[PDB]
Design a binder for these strands. Structure first.
Length: 312
DNA sequence: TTGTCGCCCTT
DNA sequence: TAATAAGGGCGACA
């Protein structure tokens, strides 16, 4: 995996194009099978065979903003999507321990780090909001969980409304009702007199990473879980409640659309955003939809989890 | 030592 | 559509 430098269809070992490689260089095979997008500059192409490229990083270049954009082989992408299903199972398996950490800690002092960590995790289990790196608030004015400010939180008699503009300039709005364990903690954490101050003012990227580590997962894995949970809950609702049960793919398309609408994915991106490939393997036998119709969601969830575990 | 950067990878 | 944008995780850095 040496990075070779690309200029008009030709490869060089150096960024100034003084050292051309042999026309027989294995990397020319890669160029037979990929198209380099023409908006990229300063392109590098890794020196490897096509069979190797298929499984990992293929080429990289700069977009108009100067960001290095990284392009992977289809087997890498396939693998990545498999890992997502496994991550679903991993989070599923650790949620009890997370809720134990949350439920213990939300009884604590408002300016305690572990209290803020408990509220952070609890917001994640509820709304699946992205991590919220500082970088993107600075760069793009993007807000996520870590970058929430008191201005984003509105308290009213029996509810709390969280409103912000997250990735891709999509507005999000979440509601916490009085009966919910999150209500009182959030009520006490938010500081209405400091609207420009961060809500998690005792947190830091370092603190969040060190805390999530105890559960053997990343914060983004919580989102993966919540989004696919919502997916599966929609699929289950649909099989249970739709009057004339729709065709297999009309059913999935409908379920992708309902999820996309609430998560805030575009109708294009939503297509492949969730665990629709899993539902595809499962509908492959005739009994499935019958079984699902006769399940509680918890037992449906366990059937789906069991499928993923035993898939590979 | 601890908030920020940049590379790699993901959505 | 057709053209191709912007998040997270974590080592690296002073």
């Amino acid at each position: 995996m040496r990075a070779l430098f690309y200029k008009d269809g030709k490869l060089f070992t150096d960024n100034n194009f003084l050292n051309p490689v042999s026309d027989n260089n294995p990397a020319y095979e890669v160029l037979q099978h990929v198209k380099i997008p023409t908006h990229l500059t300063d392109v590098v192409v890794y020196g490897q065979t096509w069979e190797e490229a298929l499984t990992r990083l293929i080429f990289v270049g700069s977009d108009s903003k100067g960001r290095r954009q990284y392009f992977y082989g289809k087997m890498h992408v396939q693998n990545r999507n498999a890992k997502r299903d496994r991550i679903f199972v991993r989070v599923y398996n650790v949620m009890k321990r997370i809720n134990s950490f949350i439920n213990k800690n939300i009884k604590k002092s408002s300016t305690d780090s572990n209290y803020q960590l408990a509220v952070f995790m609890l917001m994640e289990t509820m709304f699946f909001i992205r991590f919220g790196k500082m970088k993107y608030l600075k760069e793009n004015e993007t807000v996520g969980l870590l970058t929430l400010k008191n201005k984003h939180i509105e308290i009213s008699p029996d509810k709390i409304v969280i409103k912000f503009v997250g990735k891709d300039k999509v507005s999000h709005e979440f509601v916490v009702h009085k009966s919910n364990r999150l209500y009182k903690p959030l009520l006490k954490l938010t500081d209405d007199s400091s609207p420009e101050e961060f809500l998690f003012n005792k947190l830091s990227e370092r603190k969040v990473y060190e805390s999530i580590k105890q559960f053997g997962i990343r914060i983004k894995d919580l989102r993966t879980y919540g989004v696919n949970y919502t997916f599966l809950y929609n699929f289950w609702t649909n099989v249970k409640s739709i009057s004339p049960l729709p065709s297999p793919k009309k059913l999935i398309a409908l379920t992708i659309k309902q999820t996309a609408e609430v998560v805030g994915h575009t109708p294009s991106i939503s297509k492949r955003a969730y665990m629709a490939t899993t539902i595809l393997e499962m509908v492959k036998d005739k009994n499935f939809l019958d079984v699902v119709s006769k399940t509680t969601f918890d037992e449906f969830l366990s059937i789906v989890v069991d499928h993923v575990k035993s898939s590979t």
